[PDB]
């Protein structure tokens, strides 16, 4: 599995276990991601902070 | 441990275990915190995201 990094033009291969790609942005600016990478369980989304996760290569 | 909430007007005595009050804001907007509460080890931020912790009475 491969996930993108903050900067889309780059990615990394997830380490054993972490079988997910996540995206993290503020509710205010949804199209402006601020965190990118691999993860085990999608972080809980609060009010102003959203977490989006997918299981495909470079989808986050 | 007096900890303020996402909405300053409110504050919840940070429960057992959690002995730190934090503020979560997006560097691009230091005054518009997006999260506040009780966290164990102050999460390590990045270039766009920032976490600030303290253990004083209503410090965050």
UniProtKB/Swiss-Prot annotation, chains A, B:
Q: Name one GO cellular component term.
A: other organism cell membrane
Alphabetically sorted, this entry's keywords are: Cardiotoxin, Cytolysis, Disulfide bond, Hemolysis, Membrane, Secreted, Signal, Target cell membrane, Target membrane, Toxin
Cell location? Secreted; Target cell membrane
What is the tissue specificity?
Expressed by the venom gland.
**Organism superkingdom:** Eukaryota
Gene Ontology BP annotations: killing of cells of another organism
Query: Would the keyword Secreted turn up in this protein's UniProt record?
Result: yes
MF term (GO), any: toxin activity
Q: List the disulfide bonds.
A: 3-21, 14-38, 42-53, 54-59
Give the family from UniProt.
Belongs to the three-finger toxin family. Short-chain subfamily. Type IA cytotoxin sub-subfamily.
| Assembly and oligomerization | Monomer in solution; Homodimer and oligomer in the presence of negatively charged lipids forming a pore with a size ranging between 20 and 30 Angstroms. Interacts with Kv channel-interacting protein 1 (KCNIP1) in a calcium-independent manner.
Function of the molecule: Basic protein that binds to cell membrane and depolarizes cardiomyocytes. This cytotoxin also possesses lytic activity on many other cells, including red blood cells. Interaction with sulfatides in the cell membrane induces pore formation and cell internalization. Cytotoxicity is due to pore formation, and to another mechanism independent of membrane-damaging activity. When internalized, it targets the mitochondrial membrane and induces mitochondrial swelling and fragmentation. It inhibits protein kinases C. It binds to the integrin alpha-V/beta-3 (ITGAV/ITGB3) with a moderate affinity.
Its protein name is: Cytotoxin 3
Q: What is the lineage of its organism?
A: Eukaryota, Metazoa, Chordata, Craniata, Vertebrata
């Amino acid at each position: 599995l491969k996930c993108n990094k903050l900067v889309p033009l780059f990615y990394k291969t997830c380490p054993a276990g972490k079988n997910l790609c996540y995206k993290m942005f503020m509710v205010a600016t949804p199209k402006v991601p601020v965190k990118r990478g691999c993860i085990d369980v999608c972080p809980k989304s609060s009010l102003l902070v959203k977490y989006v996760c997918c299981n495909t290569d470079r989808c986050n």
